[PDB]
Amino acid sequence: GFPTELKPGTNQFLTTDDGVSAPILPNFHPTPCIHIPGEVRNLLELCQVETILEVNNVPTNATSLMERLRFPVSAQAGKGELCAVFRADPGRNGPWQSTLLGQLCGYYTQWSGSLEVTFMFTGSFMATGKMLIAYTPPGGPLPKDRATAMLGTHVIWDFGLQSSVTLVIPWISNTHYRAHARDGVFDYYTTGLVSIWYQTNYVVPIGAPNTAYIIALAAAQKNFTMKLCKDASDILQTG
Amino acid sequence: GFPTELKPGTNQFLTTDDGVSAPILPNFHPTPCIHIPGEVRNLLELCQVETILEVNNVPTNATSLMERLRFPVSAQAGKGELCAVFRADPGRNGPWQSTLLGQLCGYYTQWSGSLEVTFMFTGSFMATGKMLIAYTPPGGPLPKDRATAMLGTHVIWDFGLQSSVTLVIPWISNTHYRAHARDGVFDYYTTGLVSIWYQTNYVVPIGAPNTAYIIALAAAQKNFTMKLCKDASDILQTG
Amino acid sequence: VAQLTIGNSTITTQEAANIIVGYGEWPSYCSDSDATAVDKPTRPDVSVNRFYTLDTKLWEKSSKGWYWKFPDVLTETGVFGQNAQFHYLYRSGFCIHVQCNASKFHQGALLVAVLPEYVIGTVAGGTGTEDTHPPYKQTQPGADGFELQHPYVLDAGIPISQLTVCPHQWINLRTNNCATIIVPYINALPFDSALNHCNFGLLVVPISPLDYDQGATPVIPITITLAPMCSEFAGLR
Amino acid sequence: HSTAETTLDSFFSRAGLVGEIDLPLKGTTNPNGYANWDIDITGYAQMRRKVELFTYMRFDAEFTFVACTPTGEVVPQLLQYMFVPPGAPKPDSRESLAWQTATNPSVFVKLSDPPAQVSVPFMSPASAYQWFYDGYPTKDLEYGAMPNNMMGTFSVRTVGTSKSKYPLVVRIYMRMKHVRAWIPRPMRNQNYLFKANPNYAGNSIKPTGASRTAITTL
Amino acid sequence: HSTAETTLDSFFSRAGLVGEIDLPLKGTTNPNGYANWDIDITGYAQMRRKVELFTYMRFDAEFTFVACTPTGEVVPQLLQYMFVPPGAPKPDSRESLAWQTATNPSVFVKLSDPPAQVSVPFMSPASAYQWFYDGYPTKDLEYGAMPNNMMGTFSVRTVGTSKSKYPLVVRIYMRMKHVRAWIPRPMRNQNYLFKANPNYAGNSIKPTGASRTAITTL
């Protein structure tokens, strides 16, 4: 015959070896693939979709779960008051878990790209005012007050003019490794922060509700990426 | 020699692997194939052949078995009366078992195509009358009477004019799977139905028999097909 | 503002807000080289394809949300429900239009999305040990629709917070009132049953609750008007 | 700069464990030295939720068989793995004639011989496997049942007329290949209760993710 | 749209079981640790009726041998499979010189070695194997006897001068390849009684298929 020497790894079964195997049904002609709308090809398509960010992830009472989707603003809040705050940690617990992006980050170990949060005011049409939305890069501590946050990368939002506004998070990178307990977790540290302060108070004419809610929607830019498939889940197929 | 690694499936015997094996008699020159009439190449050739359909599959009495091949029409039958009925189920029990098509469907699991039944009046030449032949697609219940069947896809047949007539069954598809008892059977459901009613009565002059028979012949169109070889039989080679 | 007509149906609607053509595809027909090229499938144009205006649902502060099934919603309604029933197969695209009528003194936000193969899952007894299957009134509510009981998980164990991944459109009272969506035929087969399979379900839920000061109308009428696109049928019975 | 890892195929590759057969000598479990395993890709826990991200899918499966005694030992015993396509009858006994029906692919291999491995095609008579079906097949218990999603059964047994001399354990891995998916949908956020439907616990309805005290504290 | 499966070759492929040799230690069956098997393709029950659909046929056969002890065990025993072409003399004993006649192809293999496998040509001196012969070879018992349809004999035995130490069982599979058929004919609708002729039971003459009550009821 033809001279050969078998090399180590012969007869082994690698769960990730993508070789070919013998077709059980050689003659079978599987029913032809026809056209179906919205085919997905690469998960990052999904990551660029706006999902509701449960910033108000505080109520747990079963019947108030719908409340996590929206946080509110009211007349009672005085100028300068801090409305709300959260981090730019897509994969870690908290707000991002609600977004689709967050859930997909979970099947991966590393990632990086620019994010993008959009705020939607759902209050009465007659209401007006200004909100200051500031981003404090990783490391920078949550600004003491409105004015100090006013010096950072911020955006004055007048929902009297535009009902929507989108903020871009320049960058977030879950790359810095951590071996705490005895379980190694490739964690953030890049917990960028997004604060939101009442630049002015909530103003309304008689006849309009003195409270309104807002909805956070997030997605990642086209420059987003992920690495290291890592299946992990609390939800599994029960016996 | 030449470096090689054996992959799983090595040394296995697949009853369907169509590889090559060593010729026991290398020098032997087998007697040359000469020309023989009517060579068959693909079974579907056979399926397009007209075979007698035992519509009248009722007598079992050994000496009356020849009766299954033909059903009759007579003077006694009044206008509108239902002469006969059956389904368009090539592979299932009943009438189709007699046709060659039926028997071939048995060695296969799935199939689909247009069928074609031809009726032959074998009565006296002096007889005349009309028969209504209607097809009720799958789902549609056997028409109550002649008139309601008259509204469906039908054909008035005057055997006073033409002794033959051929009906086409647009489509039949044994594709809908069924796991009843604990034995999974890819069954019809497409039991299309073919009804036949005495549009007019049987008319004859003195001297001619008041009964005549008819013969059903079926085959499938050229658009017929079958899938999944499945050997099955009640008749086997005895010990 | 202007009014469009399709036969005997004439709706008064706004010029042309942003429409959402689900999955970037337009409800088209199906060519001759298919599964049933013999039983040439008749395509309704006349009355069958026009503007149906379903029984308006009333938005409330406590409203949890609503959903209808397709084509179920219409198999009861008019000459279209006529075809869907006495016919063997069906494929059809849809133009859905949803509008509210509220004063500039009401506030709210309704997410309106379409979800293929919307399979309802009930509570399962409560403790999780009862294999109770959703009724027929819950699986195919008709033209009255049905109310969610667990909006957060869309009565099916899925976050609504992620429903935007489906052909959706928003209706924020302080900006718009009408939302429109074009839906193509979506199924693993060219044709299918119109009474057994509901290719999809229209979802409309209050993400930001309805609100107003005492004295303003307490219920905001939501009017769903919809029209069949390139609808086809085969095998009459 | 590359995004090869975020593709469908990349996401669904890897041969996961989806089945495990026990063939004890003395036992309540599979007493006839044989077993039938209807192909369930949910066999790998993590799987269900991953696929249930899409409405429709299509793919081929590569099966690799790992057999040994409970302690993971290798012994001189021959085995028959039979694949009964959907629609074909599974063996009711250790001598059912199904074991010899040519139309049921079978593969033989010694425990010593490395893993057995075969590819199985896209069976479904439909254009795609569909994880969700909003209807019934022509209040009911047939709701959400798309049967045309059956891949088939795998029948395993010791070769020979007599019971095997050793206690055996077969493990079935499955790599999904050539994947295509359509219509993406909300990621299951509630615990699964049944293998058939999406029903959840209406008491234990938990918030998608970790909660906190105030919306002003981190 | 494709009709590859309905071809002759497709229909007749698959290696079916057509033979089984028993070589017990203590026994009434094959007491001399050897056996002769004249090639019968009817060995696979289902076969007879399938081929008897045609009048004439032609083909090659691929034989695969499966040997083990009754429990399907593998043991260190060597075996000789001898093919005696038609016209060649089969061995009358475990020491017949036929076993050593070069003109009788023989193949040796250990039970451990995977299945033995060889192809056998279209033997027949005629242009085709013919399942039906309406005559006699130059009331009789030679009716329907087309002898020129013999493929040959397969003689099996344990290697060595002495009986084997183990009880053995050989199984012979046969895949038919390169098939050509002529003159199709009515599908046997009655039960077979003999391997030679088409004789049937003249009392038990059953209707081709399932009967019903009236021709107006379904």
From TrEMBL, chains A, B:
Top-level taxon of origin: Viruses
Localization per record: Host cytoplasm; Virion
Domain Picornavirus capsid: 29-198
Subunit structure: Interacts with capsid protein VP1 and capsid protein VP3 to form heterotrimeric protomers.
Described function: Lies on the inner surface of the capsid shell. After binding to the host receptor, the capsid undergoes conformational changes. Capsid protein VP4 is released, Capsid protein VP1 N-terminus is externalized, and together, they shape a pore in the host membrane through which the viral genome is translocated into the host cell cytoplasm.
Family stated for the protein in its record: Belongs to the picornaviruses polyprotein family.
Protein name in the entry: Genome polyprotein
Species for this entry: Human enterovirus 71 (EV71)
UniProtKB/TrEMBL annotation, chain C:
Subcellular location: Host cytoplasm; Virion
Domain Picornavirus capsid positions: 12-212
Subunit structure: Interacts with capsid protein VP1 and capsid protein VP3 to form heterotrimeric protomers.
Role of this protein: Lies on the inner surface of the capsid shell. After binding to the host receptor, the capsid undergoes conformational changes. Capsid protein VP4 is released, Capsid protein VP1 N-terminus is externalized, and together, they shape a pore in the host membrane through which the viral genome is translocated into the host cell cytoplasm.
Family: Belongs to the picornaviruses polyprotein family.
Protein name, entry field: Genome polyprotein
Native species: Human enterovirus 71
Shown part of the complete sequence: 82 to 318 of 862
UniProtKB/TrEMBL annotation, chains D, E:
Cellular component terms per the entry's GO annotation: host cell; virion component
Domain Picornavirus capsid VP1: 1-186
Keyword annotations of the record: Capsid protein, Host cytoplasm, Host-virus interaction, Lipoprotein, Myristate, T=pseudo3 icosahedral capsid protein, Viral attachment to host cell, Virion, Virus entry into host cell
Signal peptide: none
Record-level GO BP terms: symbiont entry into host cell; virion attachment to host cell
Subcellular location: Host cytoplasm; Virion
Entry superkingdom: Viruses
Record's protein name: Genome polyprotein
